[PDB]
Write an enzyme that holds these catalytic residues in place. Structure first.
Site, PDB file in Angstrom:
ATOM      1  N   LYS A 157       0.813  -1.210   0.000  1.00  0.00           N
ATOM      2  CA  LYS A 157       0.000   0.000   0.000  1.00  0.00           C
ATOM      3  C   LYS A 157       0.851   1.266   0.000  1.00  0.00           C
ATOM      4  O   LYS A 157       1.762   1.398   0.833  1.00  0.00           O
ATOM      5  CB  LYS A 157      -0.909  -0.002   1.248  1.00  0.00           C
ATOM      6  CG  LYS A 157      -1.739   1.257   1.479  1.00  0.00           C
ATOM      7  CD  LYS A 157      -2.749   1.454   0.356  1.00  0.00           C
ATOM      8  CE  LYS A 157      -3.498   2.795   0.436  1.00  0.00           C
ATOM      9  NZ  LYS A 157      -2.641   4.011   0.664  1.00  0.00           N
ATOM     10  N   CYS A 189      -1.263  10.277  -6.831  1.00  0.00           N
ATOM     11  CA  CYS A 189      -2.455  10.086  -5.975  1.00  0.00           C
ATOM     12  C   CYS A 189      -3.463  11.248  -6.113  1.00  0.00           C
ATOM     13  O   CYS A 189      -3.147  12.383  -5.711  1.00  0.00           O
ATOM     14  CB  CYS A 189      -2.078   9.941  -4.503  1.00  0.00           C
ATOM     15  SG  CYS A 189      -3.562   9.797  -3.464  1.00  0.00           S
TER      16      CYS A 189
HETATM   17  C1  LIG Z   1      -9.253   1.023  -3.656  1.00  0.00           C
HETATM   18  C2  LIG Z   1      -8.108   1.622  -4.414  1.00  0.00           C
HETATM   19  C3  LIG Z   1      -7.033   2.242  -3.749  1.00  0.00           C
HETATM   20  C4  LIG Z   1      -5.985   2.789  -4.491  1.00  0.00           C
HETATM   21  N1  LIG Z   1      -4.912   3.393  -3.832  1.00  0.00           N
HETATM   22  C5  LIG Z   1      -3.739   3.562  -4.542  1.00  0.00           C
HETATM   23  C6  LIG Z   1      -2.519   3.778  -3.893  1.00  0.00           C
HETATM   24  O1  LIG Z   1      -2.404   3.491  -2.691  1.00  0.00           O
HETATM   25  N2  LIG Z   1      -1.375   3.956  -4.645  1.00  0.00           N
HETATM   26  C7  LIG Z   1      -1.427   3.882  -6.025  1.00  0.00           C
HETATM   27  O2  LIG Z   1      -0.425   4.027  -6.709  1.00  0.00           O
HETATM   28  N3  LIG Z   1      -2.616   3.657  -6.661  1.00  0.00           N
HETATM   29  C8  LIG Z   1      -3.749   3.403  -5.934  1.00  0.00           C
HETATM   30  N4  LIG Z   1      -4.940   3.255  -6.610  1.00  0.00           N
HETATM   31  C9  LIG Z   1      -4.856   3.147  -8.111  1.00  0.00           C
HETATM   32  C10 LIG Z   1      -4.562   1.709  -8.569  1.00  0.00           C
HETATM   33  O3  LIG Z   1      -3.236   1.353  -8.254  1.00  0.00           O
HETATM   34  C11 LIG Z   1      -4.712   1.530 -10.068  1.00  0.00           C
HETATM   35  O4  LIG Z   1      -3.756   2.400 -10.646  1.00  0.00           O
HETATM   36  C12 LIG Z   1      -6.110   1.852 -10.626  1.00  0.00           C
HETATM   37  O5  LIG Z   1      -7.171   1.433  -9.778  1.00  0.00           O
HETATM   38  C13 LIG Z   1      -6.318   1.310 -12.041  1.00  0.00           C
HETATM   39  O6  LIG Z   1      -6.294  -0.103 -12.132  1.00  0.00           O
HETATM   40  P1  LIG Z   1      -7.661  -0.953 -12.335  1.00  0.00           P
HETATM   41  O7  LIG Z   1      -8.336  -0.422 -13.564  1.00  0.00           O
HETATM   42  O8  LIG Z   1      -7.202  -2.373 -12.458  1.00  0.00           O
HETATM   43  O9  LIG Z   1      -8.449  -0.612 -11.084  1.00  0.00           O
HETATM   44  C14 LIG Z   1      -6.007   2.732  -5.890  1.00  0.00           C
HETATM   45  C15 LIG Z   1      -7.082   2.105  -6.537  1.00  0.00           C
HETATM   46  C16 LIG Z   1      -8.128   1.569  -5.808  1.00  0.00           C
HETATM   47  C17 LIG Z   1      -9.268   0.901  -6.533  1.00  0.00           C
HETATM   48  O1  LIG Z   2      -5.584   5.943  -1.518  1.00  0.00           O
HETATM   49  C1  LIG Z   2      -5.966   6.752  -2.367  1.00  0.00           C
HETATM   50  O2  LIG Z   2      -6.659   7.721  -2.073  1.00  0.00           O
HETATM   51  C2  LIG Z   2      -5.617   6.620  -3.801  1.00  0.00           C
HETATM   52  C3  LIG Z   2      -4.287   6.750  -4.129  1.00  0.00           C
HETATM   53  C4  LIG Z   2      -3.924   6.663  -5.438  1.00  0.00           C
HETATM   54  O3  LIG Z   2      -2.680   6.785  -5.640  1.00  0.00           O
HETATM   55  N1  LIG Z   2      -4.911   6.431  -6.373  1.00  0.00           N
HETATM   56  C5  LIG Z   2      -6.231   6.312  -6.046  1.00  0.00           C
HETATM   57  O4  LIG Z   2      -7.174   6.122  -6.913  1.00  0.00           O
HETATM   58  N2  LIG Z   2      -6.556   6.416  -4.740  1.00  0.00           N
END
Ligand SMILES: Cc1cc2nc3c(=O)[nH]c(=O)nc-3n(C[C@H](O)[C@H](O)[C@H](O)COP(=O)(O)O)c2cc1C
Ligand SMILES: O=C(O)c1cc(=O)[nH]c(=O)[nH]1
Ligand SMILES: Cc1cc2nc3c(=O)[nH]c(=O)nc-3n(C[C@H](O)[C@H](O)[C@H](O)COP(=O)(O)O)c2cc1C
Ligand SMILES: O=C(O)c1cc(=O)[nH]c(=O)[nH]1
Ligand SMILES: [Cl-]
Ligand SMILES: [Cl-]
Ligand SMILES: [Cl-]
Ligand SMILES: [Cl-]
Ligand SMILES: [Cl-]
Ligand SMILES: [Cl-]
Ligand SMILES: [Cl-]
Lengths: 314, 314
Positions: free
Chosen positions: A45, A132
């Site tokens: 995370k 983010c």
């Molecule tokens: C619940 C959630 C939390 C996320 N938090 C982060 C984060 O901690 N750091 C990060 O780089 N991306 C985070 N993201 C973005 C995801 O890493 C990813 O880039 C994005 O959801 C696209 O991929 P997907 O289409 O497979 O969901 C988060 C996404 C979701 C759904």
């Molecule tokens: O934890 C989050 O708020 C978060 C971080 C991130 O890098 N991308 C995202 O969609 N959410």
């Protein structure tokens, strides 16, 4: 005979699959479950120096065409993920990435100063989050090119290892060029992860006449089916512009065929977010089998045979 | 009793629906068909001073979840659309918008100088396109805030009428704020159309291992179901930040319910792009019937009763 093996960053990976940072990787239980899974790797995370409880709930919603979230960087804090990397993680099973999302350059510098020795000793790999979109008051660093350069310079000064960057999506060639120029100045930036969510969408429920998440008046990052063409564009745009670097794809992966598209576009590793969120880590067994089936049908034995080989018409 | 009537810009509109500026509006046949249709209004194809054949075909692809295109501003040239607005359009039936997409500020100023007289005499209304993502070597003007301010100054100086602007999508609050600040400097900008396509996506066909459009190595603007949350976010973000202006919604409208969501977000007019491209002008009969069905279910009699009243959970 076929193989999903990937070799990069002085590591061998069984297959290109891993979680997207933010999904299924916050707790000890999550990280052990990811390590026990069939995934080729995992990333912890995105962390801040201090524990964060995150934004108020509901802050995630699964949708027919994907997901919207405004989690607000909920995480156990850097000390927690550093300890996992330093003392707990089973490196005999698979490599580990650690995602870092300091709220300032100075925070990133202080965390990286401590991470360096664990990288050297244990081989954890940094993925620095420049994208983010859900911490209120703090824009995506990678949408301010001067700020991005400042961050990368400051980190490079104190973190003598190869690392990667997690990027927000861009939507025009002038920005792909500007971003690539900056990244190409840092030989130590050895991978680029495209993409973080499509930022600040707004989902409204017709029945309730209401937004579906509580923070930020309902504005949140989009994932899943919504983002695949944007993700592939960013993967390929940087693949073309950053020949010295690896590209990790993230966005819209639900099947081995979606993974195949990311690899065609240029992806070395493929990260899974929304689909993993809804299915859990069993998904990796299905994705590897599905990708192998696609490759079988097409007569490909390895990923090297088609990576970056998307065909253009002009 | 219920009504879809909208009153703005010194005109009365039967309903909020119209075409989006790239769709069903390039030829005389197109424009007459839009006028004969059930739409509240219409807008002519984004024009340049000279006729343009546009980018190499094939350059539009309908997709299960929307569309991708790299059209390249194919259009019959300003004189053609000006002539339509001056001589041909049935203003007795509905108002007319004219979309302008000069490739430089000088071009926009030249055209606006000539448009002024026909706006005065016939009441055609300018939608100035600051957001075309498909002309090679030409980034979106609205992604360069200095360029945008300069364009609006130059146009406002020569054009003695209210007009509107077609915007690309933004993805962070810092950009919503900066863009709204600029627009708020210009009292002649009386409407904001949100959004143009999500720029430079990349669709790949797994079967053929190929991109699906010829120009720009397969990169093109995304429309349709992909874009609804992004469109709603932009509509609502500008609705909130530009209280002195009207917002027109554009993006992801296939049903009356989709239109209802745009209106809740703050839209005055609702533009239809990909769905109209695929269904043709009869679509407006369905959309008006559907939106009245949604209002009936909820006991709404007019659009004023719920425009901009999307509910937050915070
Ligand atoms: C619940 C959630 C939390 C996320 N938090 C982060 C984060 O901690 N750091 C990060 O780089 N991306 C985070 N993201 C973005 C995801 O890493 C990813 O880039 C994005 O959801 C696209 O991929 P997907 O289409 O497979 O969901 C988060 C996404 C979701 C759904
Ligand atoms: O934890 C989050 O708020 C978060 C971080 C991130 O890098 N991308 C995202 O969609 N959410
Ligand atoms: C074939 C095509 C051509 C387009 N050309 C223009 C253009 O000339 N000017 C403009 O402002 N928008 C143009 N667009 C963008 C649309 O007006 C609209 O903003 C976008 O498609 C989102 O709406 P949708 O989701 O209903 O398609 C074009 C879209 C399509 C599909
Ligand atoms: O014709 C085009 O290139 C076009 C213009 C525009 O403004 N938006 C879009 O998606 N395409
Ligand atoms: Cl939640
Ligand atoms: Cl949910
Ligand atoms: Cl472990
Ligand atoms: Cl075509
Ligand atoms: Cl007519
Ligand atoms: Cl008339
Ligand atoms: Cl549509």
């Amino acid at each position: 005979t076929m193989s999903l093996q990937v070799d990069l960053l002085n590591n061998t990976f069984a297959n290109p699959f891993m979680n997207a940072a933010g999904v299924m990787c916050s707790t000890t239980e999550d990280l052990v479950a990811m390590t026990e899974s069939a995934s080729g790797s995992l990333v912890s995370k995105s962390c801040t120096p201090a524990l964060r409880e995150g934004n108020p709930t509901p802050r995630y919603r699964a949708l027919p065409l994907g997901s919207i979230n405004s989690m607000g960087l909920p995480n156990n804090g850097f000390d927690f993920y550093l300890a996992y990397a330093a003392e707990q993680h089973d490196y005999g099973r698979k490599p580990l990435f650690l995602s870092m999302s300091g709220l300032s350059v100075r925070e990133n510098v202080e965390m990286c100063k401590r991470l360096a020795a664990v990288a050297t000793e244990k081989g954890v790999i940094l993925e620095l989050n420049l994208s983010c979109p859900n911490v209120p008051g703090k824009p995506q660093v990678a949408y301010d090119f001067d700020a991005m350069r400042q961050c990368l310079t400051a980190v490079s000064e104190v973190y003598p290892h190869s690392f990667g960057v997690k990027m927000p999506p861009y939507f025009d060639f002038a920005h792909f060029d500007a971003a690539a120029e900056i990244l190409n100045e840092f030989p130590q930036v050895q991978f680029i992860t495209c993409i973080n969510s499509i930022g600040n969408g707004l989902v409204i429920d017709a029945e309730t006449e209401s937004v579906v998440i509580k923070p930020k008046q309902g504005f949140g990052g989009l994932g899943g089916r919504y983002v695949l063409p944007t993700a592939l564009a960013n993967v390929n745009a940087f693949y073309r512009r950053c020949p010295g670097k690896l590209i990790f794809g993230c966005g819209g992966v639900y099947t081995g065929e979606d993974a195949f598209l990311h690899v065609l576009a240029g992806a070395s590793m493929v990260q899974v977010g929304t689909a993993l969120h809804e299915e859990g880590p069993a998904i990796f067994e299905r994705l590897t089998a599905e990708l192998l089936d696609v490759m079988a049908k097409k007569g490909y034995q390895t990923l090297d045979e088609f990576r970056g080989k998307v065909r253009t018409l002009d």
